[PDB]
Amino acid sequence: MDLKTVTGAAVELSDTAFGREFNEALVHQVVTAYLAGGRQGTRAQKTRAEVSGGGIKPWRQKGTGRARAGSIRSPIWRGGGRAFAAKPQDWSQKVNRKMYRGAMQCILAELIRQERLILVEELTISAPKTKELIAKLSELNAPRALIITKEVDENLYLAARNIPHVNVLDTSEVDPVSLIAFDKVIMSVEAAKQFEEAL
Amino acid sequence: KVKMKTKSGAAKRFKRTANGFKRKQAFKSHILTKKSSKRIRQLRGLKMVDKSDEAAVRRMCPYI
Amino acid sequence: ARVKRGVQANRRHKKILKRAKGYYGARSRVYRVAVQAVTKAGQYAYRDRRNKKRTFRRLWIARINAGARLNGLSYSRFINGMKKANITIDRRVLADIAMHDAATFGALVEKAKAEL
Amino acid sequence: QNSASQRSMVRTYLKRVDAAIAAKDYDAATEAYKKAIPVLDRMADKGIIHKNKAARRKSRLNKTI
Amino acid sequence: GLRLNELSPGVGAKKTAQRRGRGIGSGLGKTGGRGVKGQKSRSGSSIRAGFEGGQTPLYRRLPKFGFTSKMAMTTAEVRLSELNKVEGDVISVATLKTANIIRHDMKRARIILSGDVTKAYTFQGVKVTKGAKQAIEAAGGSI
RNA sequence: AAGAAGCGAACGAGGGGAAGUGAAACAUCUCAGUACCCUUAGGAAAAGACAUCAAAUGAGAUUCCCCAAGUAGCGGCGAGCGAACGGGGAGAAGCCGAUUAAUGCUAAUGUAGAAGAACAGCGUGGGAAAGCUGACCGUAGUAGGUGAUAGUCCUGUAUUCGAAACAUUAGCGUUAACAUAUUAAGUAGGGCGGGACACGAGAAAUCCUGUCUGAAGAUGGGGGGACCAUCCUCCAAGGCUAAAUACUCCUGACUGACCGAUAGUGAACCAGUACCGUGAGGGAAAGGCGAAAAGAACCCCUGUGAGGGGAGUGAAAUAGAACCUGAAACCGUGUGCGUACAAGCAGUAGGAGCCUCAAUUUAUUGGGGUGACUGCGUACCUUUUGUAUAAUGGGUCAGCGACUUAUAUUCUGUAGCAAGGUUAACCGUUUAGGGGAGCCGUAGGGAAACCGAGUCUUAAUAGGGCGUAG
């Protein structure tokens, strides 16, 4: 509810969006759905129909003393088609709107609970230059962090992108896999308010 | 899109109800003359599908 | 996500061929024969684990009979005399005493014959 | 994540251009739009945003200007 | 909020699928539960719906009865508990459509005594049962 | 004088058009207007403006997507086939020149390229990129290589960028080829026989026509699912029209919980090759030395052969060219024990002796190898009432080999919301957010009208049937 900025300013964040109890099963479902929808699912094998040749019966049904065959591209044979050859698949899952919103709520609440969320009044990099961002991170004692705030400036983006584990995202376009993955989170009070309105 | 095909005749034969299936009784079409009046009166009216038969009726007509 | 069976198949087959060490012919060299010999060996071990107790009771009874007849008594009377004397010594210990200590078995036979 | 940040950076500039349209000042809109153009062209190559969509946005913005 | 390394679905959320013909120990070996060699153990075997082995099926033993009424497809019954979705006080067919209580192509609507009326409504072009009317005018609505 | 011919992926349009199969048979039907044959275009094609629906307060061309809905219907009413009205979206456009082909300007793109930051010391190592220490660049930090794993060694990446010449796209200008109806008669409709409409002649509307016929022509005609009347809607017998839609022989960039030499294209290799066939046609196998050939000078045995032993090289030569590793079947050599008086699924439970390692203050135990002798013991799988069965299958080893995917539906578990739940297509700087069309539940009775915690049957208000947390 009542949090501190790095400077010391008191911030009022609602409990339903930043204090909801952690639901591990729901967070798991949403995170796995995001990971599954990250899949391309582009592959295929060739069935006996589409494997080259194989139209003729290799030998006559009886009299040769051999196990019967109908084609040289049956899955039993070397070089034959795949029984149940895979095709392109759609791995995306439909996440319920409320389930996703609640998973985000729980993720934020647990980030606060384990102190991996840091509120700042503002974060504006004066010029495109990595070292300035590194200097700011030095005083904030957050070598690795995920930065989310009202808007993303080109200079802050250019500074952030090169850094190994520093990434910048707008408040609207925020993912649970990112929030969970990156060790520390830097987030503005205005962005927090907009998260309250969104959730 | 691909959907299950309900049997058209089954759809006509069976009508849905809350807890059962209702069907018309047999043996009323024709030669009725020899049949006794009590049999005709008893045959008249709706009847309830048997517990065993309901399982197959459900597979035949799921949407109903 | 293809799976190759080579490594796991190799280790599975090596386990059986290791348990089949010392067997004759194909039984210790080729898997199709070794696996049957290992299963049949396990069956024999399972059955002889039952049978060994019977065999050793047989041997103990034979030795006790020999000792009792050396001391002038038969097994069916010596055991009856034990049971009437309330002597609880098992047949394994009785056979050990008969085989390695003649005088103590003579004393036991004396007690049995006094109880008969 | 990186691609998401690349996408994120453009939206702020487009919102600024929209505010410039609301102001109805020629130079303020022009500077912001010219600032945006190359970044959109660059993102088009990556395939994150459709080339047809980028061309439609450029035509709409030019018409607005 | 935890790590990606330590999220779990919870007990009972996930079940492992059965794989037929993967040895003796699995309990599905050699057959996959299909039994022994009959018609139902073959690859393309099914349970033909409405088939009794040659005996004339039940749905052909019994006669067809009734006809389908086209009016019944355009008439929607409305429950008293569903009116909390209505915007305003007037209850007409168009208001029901915009409240999504009835489908957009329904021509007629009927209100029945199923739940309770929380506020006073004005039922204009709809049929109201005896109990629904009494409950409506008990809640204050006038028809 | 100008065109055409022939070749070549898929998609489009049109002229013909099967059978296996399913119905547990089979002829109606299905398969299916699918396979195949034939003709012919364009980047799309077709269609397209109402002689269309609707019956609602009416809407306003065509095309495609999600619902409506597996509903209404058709159906040896069997198997199966299967809409439409309308709602929500994509895209929007109406015209009578929305045509083709060049040439000439303006703008842009493409077809070669250029620059492009920052690391040293120490120890190990054949070799440093890895280890320790301490630095630097970052609009360039998970790229490929370099003797082991490099942001700072190389090629690269971020970023900024060049065109003499030619192509392509758009805008403009101009030319020369073609076209430019003026409201529609052998036409609408009808008889016979067929075909298409979800619709199989059915009460069968609507469309097409092989045959024979044949109007009105605005005071008229078409449709509104037999048909009549009223009512509503629109003007066939002239032509054209972009977008949203379908595809990939190809070109550029990028991607992959796709494969890694029995896999992945048949083809990673001189592959549609060798080989097989008269021909149509079928159709393989086969990758890897080492970081760098530094690919073994020279000597020896040998026939100037093969092959090898030295020497040398290499970090390594049982890395020596059939060259990374190097399993199994299979076949050798050596050491230990057993075996030539003893009958059989060859093992197992005991067990003497012998050999070999360790202990141990020294033939006693522990580990390992063999196994004289005693007891028991007729393989595995399959199929069966029942198998050692003389019933099937397997010569052995290595690799490959068989319950899957999509959608629909029912039950169960779990999670979110909860008398409510949820969106689909689509928009979206695209996993967010919007999109409430639509679906399930909440009410049932009856064939239906209709009624409704009731309802059906009945003259009956009696009796009875069905009913009274998703």
Short mmCIF file of C-alpha atoms (C1' of nucleotides) in Angstrom, two decimals, chain C residues 1-7 9-10 13 21-24 27 29-33 36-37 40-45 47-49 51-52 55-56, chain F residues 257-263 327-330 345-351 369-371 375-380 394-401:
data_model
loop_
_atom_site.label_atom_id
_atom_site.label_comp_id
_atom_site.label_asym_id
_atom_site.label_seq_id
_atom_site.Cartn_x
_atom_site.Cartn_y
_atom_site.Cartn_z
CA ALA C 1 12.84 -33.25 -30.72
CA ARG C 2 14.28 -36.55 -31.97
CA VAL C 3 15.59 -39.12 -29.49
CA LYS C 4 18.39 -41.51 -30.43
CA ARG C 5 18.36 -44.83 -28.58
CA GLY C 6 22.04 -45.71 -28.97
CA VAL C 7 23.53 -44.83 -25.59
CA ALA C 9 20.30 -49.26 -25.50
CA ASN C 10 24.03 -49.89 -25.09
CA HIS C 13 22.31 -54.42 -22.96
CA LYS C 21 29.07 -63.35 -17.19
CA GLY C 22 30.37 -66.90 -16.93
CA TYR C 23 27.61 -68.50 -19.01
CA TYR C 24 28.30 -70.80 -21.97
CA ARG C 27 24.40 -67.10 -23.23
CA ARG C 29 27.92 -63.13 -25.55
CA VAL C 30 24.65 -62.30 -27.36
CA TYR C 31 21.75 -60.48 -25.76
CA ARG C 32 18.82 -62.51 -27.09
CA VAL C 33 20.17 -65.62 -25.35
CA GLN C 36 16.67 -65.49 -21.08
CA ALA C 37 19.50 -67.10 -19.10
CA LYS C 40 15.88 -68.15 -15.79
CA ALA C 41 18.79 -67.80 -13.37
CA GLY C 42 16.69 -65.43 -11.27
CA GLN C 43 13.84 -67.95 -11.31
CA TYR C 44 16.20 -70.70 -10.16
CA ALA C 45 17.58 -68.48 -7.40
CA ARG C 47 13.04 -71.31 -6.11
CA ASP C 48 16.25 -72.54 -4.47
CA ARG C 49 15.94 -69.87 -1.79
CA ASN C 51 14.54 -75.22 -1.35
CA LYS C 52 17.78 -74.54 0.57
CA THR C 55 17.84 -79.31 2.03
CA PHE C 56 19.69 -78.12 5.12
"C1'" A F 257 11.45 -26.37 -27.75
"C1'" C F 258 12.64 -28.68 -36.97
"C1'" C F 259 16.81 -33.07 -38.71
"C1'" G F 260 21.86 -33.86 -38.05
"C1'" A F 261 24.67 -38.73 -42.77
"C1'" U F 262 19.79 -45.56 -41.73
"C1'" A F 263 17.96 -38.65 -39.99
"C1'" A F 327 30.60 -50.39 -29.39
"C1'" A F 328 28.48 -55.41 -30.65
"C1'" A F 329 28.15 -59.60 -33.45
"C1'" C F 330 32.36 -62.45 -35.40
"C1'" C F 345 17.08 -75.85 -22.01
"C1'" A F 346 23.72 -75.88 -19.74
"C1'" G F 347 21.49 -72.69 -15.04
"C1'" U F 348 20.64 -72.24 -9.95
"C1'" A F 349 21.41 -73.66 -4.17
"C1'" G F 350 25.38 -75.73 -1.89
"C1'" G F 351 30.60 -77.04 -2.31
"C1'" G F 369 39.27 -66.23 -11.54
"C1'" U F 370 37.89 -71.55 -12.26
"C1'" G F 371 34.38 -75.16 -10.58
"C1'" G F 375 20.04 -81.52 -4.91
"C1'" C F 376 16.38 -79.17 -8.18
"C1'" G F 377 15.60 -77.69 -13.19
"C1'" U F 378 11.92 -79.76 -20.64
"C1'" A F 379 14.11 -71.91 -23.68
"C1'" C F 380 11.36 -67.07 -25.14
"C1'" G F 394 13.54 -65.26 -34.66
"C1'" G F 395 21.12 -67.26 -37.68
"C1'" U F 396 23.64 -63.13 -34.45
"C1'" C F 397 24.90 -58.00 -33.64
"C1'" A F 398 24.30 -52.51 -34.48
"C1'" G F 399 20.89 -48.81 -36.19
"C1'" C F 400 15.50 -47.67 -37.68
"C1'" G F 401 10.18 -49.75 -36.43
#
